[PDB]
Design a protein around this ligand. Structure first.
Ligand code: K
Ligand code: K
Lengths: 754, 752
């Protein structure tokens, strides 16, 4: 829809500043180190339209549920990551007047996100008539020191006369979540400390009646500068500040570094110990130079790129896309904290609350299995196991047995508040179970599924067994009143994907129960009566199908709709979520994202080329891709069917979803969980990567518009590099023991230095 | 739950006062004259738990729509009822201490709602040891002078030794709304206080939605034997008068308080509103209590002459039916075509002031049978006059024609649930049906051939644009809807909905060929449209199952796990209060008539065999979690000769409020719910119906009833139907000779 940044291989940079595209711009320039993250907000302040957003991983608030009308079973709160105390604040005054790009005239603007070093640069000249001052910013959230945020500002007087410049590094707790249900603050300041060269604020989320955890943050600022310190009084009980000034001669420069340490109660047991660590880490960092801190940061990012960069030659728009995805994906989550997960919009916005969704096991798993240690995904599996208690509660809220994993959660308990989604989008249980299988197949490690995983599969199967009903009229089991992955169909009957996933879950669990050891089988305690019941459900599950079209019907009665292609929809009416009333969206034949195709994608090798063709040709043209998680899987499926041009088109739609604002909603933040798309399209799609009966298989094709593409993949303790050129694919074993892979049907042995 | 009033024929009276039942008492003793109304609040004041509620017809206030997640098309705001300036306030001090039933001890208590005269009586003895004082209250909201409220208080000293009494009639604008916290809704524009009278002109505060602000003018005049005393104005928001006197043992005194209430709904300007306030107050000051009361009771007596239902052998039912009609008439009597029937009338505020499809579906049949046709005619013009809002509602969903709202005050939608707001479109058909129902009953073509033709045309245009053609089935269908049975959401081809759409288009086409040249030109319906409409009627898909010989509520309904309601644990009923919404939706349980609602609307267009198959299949799946579901099914049962079943279903309609069935009558009465009993009795028990211009009956007598007699207005005739064990009897009380059909036999009525 709109591309506000230039195209470059390693940078997302622009020389244009427009107040009208501020939120979009802030989203694109977000940063993160897994421990915390934030939007590309201007630290000196900005009075125009903007979304202030800084988020601490795992730090959320239980916002009391807000709905028009209540329904029995609805959750009591919507957990959402808290917009944190503003610790980057650093107003800049020129001759006493603060800089504010919403009002100031500027020249020579540059906003540059350096993806290779993981740093955000921004520079411009403040144009105030005869008074002209250049400002150069650079900052980063250290991947070397998780609690560390580093900012640097360089000032240069371009005027013909002396000018006064004053920087006021500070910490401001007067913040709020724009999406708060009742327009109320979530932070209470516990302690503030202001000195000549330091400042710190210890805050704690306000109390709640839901018995959920309250979080304490400790933020301390330390400085490095050649400016003169000035006395300043603490402005409020919710803000601490310092002041440094300098009378710059023409062409003279000054600079200041702001080092902020951020600690939270999830890593320290008491306010006292938390406060102590805050001070100790600050003392430690004050011993390091800017270069020291930066190099340690860049060295780690360089290492990450070394292991997982995707080099595309001949198409920079595509190069920039894949690198932006992986950059923001890893900035959000790199498996460093086993307690965390991946919020849909990571640390770049508020929508969805940064909570845990089915996005993780459906779309994130494929990528983390491919480029990170298998222990990362194994832990994402345990994350759910550890929340089984909450799943039992969710199911009970709907009068169902077994485990019902939530649509939205932080502790296992449901958070979403829409009956069509909260109670009915149950396919998620199936996606959760599939992730277990996917991890097991990929890694060859069945120690999880034969233990903790068996319990999760058992309880999910228990849910399915209680949720289906037997239709005497059809002598088959059915699943009425649901919402499939395609959220543009609500409260429908026999959503194919859901029935398929339920049947598969039961089938797989029965397989696993036959493999666990006696002690485990005893604990699971699944009677022969249960197994017989489950087997009957597997045997007689109803699956809608249409002979004439040879397709699986999304849900019963789908073909009764007024079927017409997406091409018939006027461009000015798209996206339909922003232009049509909900009833119109629901009854129309338009699909939000993969549903039948999501199922086929999960079980891509279980369907024949003809079946896949029939379903793809029918559904793809009806899909509006209004979920960022839609384009990528469609690209893979297209590649699978040899629709090379369509695959590349879809690749661009996912790889550059945010960069080109495809869904006209990047103003709300980046589609982080969707950042998995480009990699999937390139590897599973273009390269045709599949894991079959324990061995890696590829069958690559090269986008006609490309010279080549190279990527690295982690597979059972081996690190492989795949390079695709016009003359065919090329493989190199970078590490690990000799491995035999399948390439278009030919077995090739890989060995180091050979 | 608990019955707090005695069972009497024409009175809802009790001699017991328990502060615990205060709110319940207040709701039950509400009064109203179609222009204004109020709960049975104690005018002298009460410091205990209570709901202050005085409401002016047509007055409302807007508030921002509130939902969890927004959907394009949702209304921007919703309307609310507003507690008006307190004009009945009249504290009574005995020896300088005001009476307060929340503190004072009393004896010989009486709370009496006289339904025949439309008057509220209350009396008791204030017990304060050596001091004992009797207090007798009487008040009414005149149906002779709509702007008039009349109160009377009689004080009688019963103790030994003289006693001091002081009454302070006043008007207090410092009122609040309970359902809110949003402090004040009224700004005082002008106050006046004299030793002889008082008045307050107030106006609702400004809103950001561009909706109307309302100004009220209230003036009080007195008539008493007590001596006037000079008293200073309490404050900026209240004006008062004071009268005192010393009563010797057994001596008494009285005081009347006449209040005139006018609103900006009837006056172009503030000073014209103020002028009227004074003019009417002068006029009323020329009349005695007896004359004001007599004029009032005379009109109520006339209302009963045309609608009374006398039941012998079931006193509980006798009181219930009378109470239903009384509160209905008190809420609305077709005096102002701009007003309607809110779920709570003038008895409370929680979701009680808007207009629902309920008046067209259930209130209409009742008013048609017991009031002059002019009343229901006004109920029709009400929708015609809000056509503009209907266009907006349709446009909010990208649809053509008119889409009448689910909930409204000004014609624009107020509801905030996509499955109801956007999808429960059967309401459009119900509104079109009301036009037909009225025409068939009255025989008056004037409305349908004019204003009605426009309403039908635009509703037809909505249908023509809302349906879609399914090439696969070569039939038109209507996907993604919610029928009357709200326990099925976003379903496809709800039979009742498709049936109503087809009917609407078919009826409109008939009407178009009959309107005059001016109307035709105004409607401007091309031949292209007419051809299209006919095609829709001709090829409309209607779900049907041959083996069960039933109309299928919606596509796929039979794939549900069909099981009788008897299988639901008794303690889990009502299910909307026990189950999660998803379970309710996928279950085969029905909230209220859906397919049966349509059969009820066209009860003579389906064969006994079709009606039996459909009733027999659906009634056992219906949980009747709607106030009117039992009444509608009672009629269908009676229609099928299921006498016991019809009676059983009827037993829950009449006393919903009197016996507080839902444990929420404390919030107010269920006015729109009070139409069920009459329907079940006359259409059901008596088998009343209009067929091709002729009136018909085929009554049976409930086993426990000795007899029942009801009045009915038809084609300018006043008929009295008396059903006894020896059969039915008829009396033509007024009007020209009329031939009716009684169980197939033609009977000529005369001696009118
Ligand atoms: K749809
Ligand atoms: K249902």
């Amino acid at each position: 829809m709109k591309r506000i940044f230039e195209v470059q291989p390693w940078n997302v940079i622009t020389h244009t500043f427009d107040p009208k595209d501020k939120r979009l711009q802030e989203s694109m320039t977000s940063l993160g180190n897994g421990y915390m993250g934030m939007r590309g907000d201007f630290e000196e302040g900005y009075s125009g339209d903007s979304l202030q957003g800084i988020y601490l991983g795992g730090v959320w608030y239980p916002d009391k549920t807000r709905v028009g009308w209540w329904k029995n079973g609805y959750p009591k709160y919507f957990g959402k990551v808290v917009n944190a105390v503003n610790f980057i604040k650093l107003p800049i005054e020129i001759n006493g007047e603060p800089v504010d790009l919403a009002k100031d005239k500027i020249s020579d603007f540059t906003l540059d996100l350096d993806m290779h070093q993981g740093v955000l640069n921004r520079s411009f000249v403040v144009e105030r008539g005869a008074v002209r001052v250049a400002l150069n910013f650079q900052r980063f959230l250290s991947v070397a020191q998780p609690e560390l945020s580093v900012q640097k500002v360089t000032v240069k007087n371009l005027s013909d006369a002396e000018v006064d410049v004053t920087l006021k590094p500070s910490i401001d707790a007067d913040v709020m979540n724009e999406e708060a249900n009742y327009d109320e603050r979530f932070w209470d300041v516990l302690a503030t400390d202001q000195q000549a060269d330091r400042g710190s604020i210890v805050a704690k989320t306000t109390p709640n009646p839901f018995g959920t955890p309250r979080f304490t943050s400790g933020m301390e600022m330390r400085l490095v500068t050649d400016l003169k310190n000035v006395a300043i009084t603490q402005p409020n009980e919710k803000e601490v500040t310092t002041a440094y000034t300098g009378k710059l001669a023409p062409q003279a420069s000054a600079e200041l570094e702001k080092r902020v340490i951020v600690v939270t109660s999830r890593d320290y047991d008491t306010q006292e110990s938390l406060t102590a660590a805050m001070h100790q880490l600050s003392d430690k960092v004050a011993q390091s130079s800017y270069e020291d801190l930066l190099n340690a940061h860049t060295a780690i990012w360089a290492q990450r790129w070394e292991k997982s960069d995707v080099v595309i030659k001949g198409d920079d728009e595509s190069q920039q896309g894949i690198r932006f995805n992986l950059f923001q994906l890893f900035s959000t989550y790199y498996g460093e904290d086993a307690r965390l997960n991946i919020g849909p919009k990571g640390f770049t916005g508020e929508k969805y609350g940064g909570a845990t969704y089915w996005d993780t096991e459906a779309f994130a798993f494929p990528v983390y299995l491919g480029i990170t240690d298998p222990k990362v995904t194994r832990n994402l599996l345990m994350y759910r196991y550890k929340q089984l208690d909450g799943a039992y509660i969710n199911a009970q809220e709907q009068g169902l047995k077994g485990a019902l994993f939530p649509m939205v959660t932080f502790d296992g308990i449901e958070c979403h508040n829409e009956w069509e989604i909260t109670f009915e989008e149950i396919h998620r249980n199936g996606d959760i179970a599939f992730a277990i299988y996917n991890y097991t197949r990929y890694t060859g490690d069945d120690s999880y599924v034969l233990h903790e995983g068996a319990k999760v599969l058992t309880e999910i199967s228990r849910f399915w067994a209680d949720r289906v009903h037997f239709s005497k009229r059809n002598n088959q089991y059915m699943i009425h009143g649901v919402t499939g992955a395609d959220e543009y169909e609500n409260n429908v009957d026999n959503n194919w994907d859901t029935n398929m996933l339920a049947q598969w879950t039961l089938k797989y669990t029965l397989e696993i129960l036959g493999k666990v050891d006696q002690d485990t089988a005893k604990q699971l305690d699944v009677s022969d009566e249960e197994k017989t019941k489950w087997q009957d459900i597997v045997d007689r599950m109803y699956l809608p199908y249409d002979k004439d079209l040879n397709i699986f019907v999304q849900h019963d009665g789908f073909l009764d709709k007024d079927i017409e292609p997406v091409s018939s929809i006027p461009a000015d009416q798209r996206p339909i979520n922003q232009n049509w009333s909900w009833d119109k969206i629901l009854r129309s034949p338009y699909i939000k994202q993969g549903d039948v195709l999501q199922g086929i994608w999960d079980f891509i090798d279980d369907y024949t080329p003809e079946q896949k063709k029939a379903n793809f040709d029918f559904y793809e043209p009806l899909t509006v891709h209004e979920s960022s998680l839609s384009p990528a899987i469609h690209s893979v499926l297209a590649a699978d069917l040899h629709y090379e041009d369509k695959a590349v088109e879809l690749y661009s739609r996912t790889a550059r979803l945010d960069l080109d604002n495809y869904n006209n909603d990047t103003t709300d933040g980046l589609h982080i969980t969707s950042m998995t798309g480009a990699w999937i399209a390139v590897v599973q799609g273009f390269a045709g990567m599949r894991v079959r009966d324990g061995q890696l298989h590829y069958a690559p094709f090269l986008p006609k518009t490309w010279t080549s593409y190279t990527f690295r993949q982690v597979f059972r303790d081996r690190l492989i590099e795949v390079s695709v050129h016009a003359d065919g694919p090329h493989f190199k074993l970078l590490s690990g023991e000799p491995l035999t892979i399948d390439v278009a049907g030919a077995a090739a042995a890989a060995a180091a230095a050979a």
